[PDB]
């Protein structure tokens, strides 16, 4: 998954696990068990006008911090005082969202940055992205180094009788080593046996 947004230049440090601040508290929270990358680049040449760019908003008030990967798009009046506001936005009752003012003559810390957060998992389930690596043929009954969907190893591959459910790709033994694998092109199950013995 790819999450995209635009923030201020000073707040790019807040896109990380275990951070505090208004972006990490009220707008976008990363899990502590995060796997993936965060990418950010300056976009002062596209998101700022000479009069100002008030298209990008952010939440400034909230009753509690967000949960990881949770999104709040509500626009109820935030009661900061000791009186019901009845949704009229008076004194001590604020509108929750405010606007970034992006002008091309801002300091670098106030210029807009575009942020993309890529999130994925590795080496447990069937995958469909892969990289630029190129495949080879299947050599069975010999000692080979293998790379199956990114999982590397060494051993002997043989035809198997195990039968995986459709949501399974790898098989593990009691010592938690991978001993079976589904070939990603022929969809056949193979057993992986070590090479040294005796």
């Amino acid at each position: 998954y790819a999450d995209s947004f635009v923030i201020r230049g000073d707040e790019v440090r807040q896109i990380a696990p275990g951070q505090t601040g208004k972006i990490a508290d009220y707008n976008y929270k990363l899990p502590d068990d995060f796997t993936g990358c965060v990418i950010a680049w300056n976009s002062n040449n596209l998101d700022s006008k000479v009069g100002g760019n008030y298209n990008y908003l952010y939440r400034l008030f909230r009753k509690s911090n967000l949960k990881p990967f949770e999104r709040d798009i509500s626009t109820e009046i935030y009661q900061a005082g000791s009186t019901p506001c009845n949704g009229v936005e008076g004194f001590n009752c604020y509108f929750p969202l405010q606007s970034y003012g992006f002008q091309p003559t801002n300091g670098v810390g106030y210029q807009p940055y575009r942020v993309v957060v890529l999130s994925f998992e590795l080496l447990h389930a069937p995958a469909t992205v892969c990289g630029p690596k190129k495949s080879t043929n299947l050599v069975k009954n010999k000692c080979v180094n293998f790379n199956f969907n990114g999982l590397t190893g060494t051993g002997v591959l043989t035809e198997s009788n195990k039968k995986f459910l459709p949501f399974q790709q790898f098989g593990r033994d009691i010592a938690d080593t991978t001993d079976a694998v589904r070939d990603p092109q022929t969809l056949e199950i193979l057993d992986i046996t070590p090479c040294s013995f005796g």
Partner: protein, 49 residues
């Protein structure tokens, strides 16, 4: 502010440290704590500040 060679030191005591009030009027380019986690600062209580 003071010059770095004659930096200033101020004592802080007897006040609630609700730093969320800095969200509207301040934007810091560097913020790093040592010995504590930023997500725990709201539950703690500080000595000799």
């Amino acid at each position: 502010f003071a010059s770095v060679y004659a930096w200033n030191r101020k004592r802080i005591s007897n006040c609630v440290a609700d730093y969320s009030v800095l969200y509207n009027s301040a934007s810091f380019s560097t913020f790093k704590c040592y010995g504590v986690s930023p997500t725990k600062l709201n539950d703690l209580c500080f000595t000799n500040v």
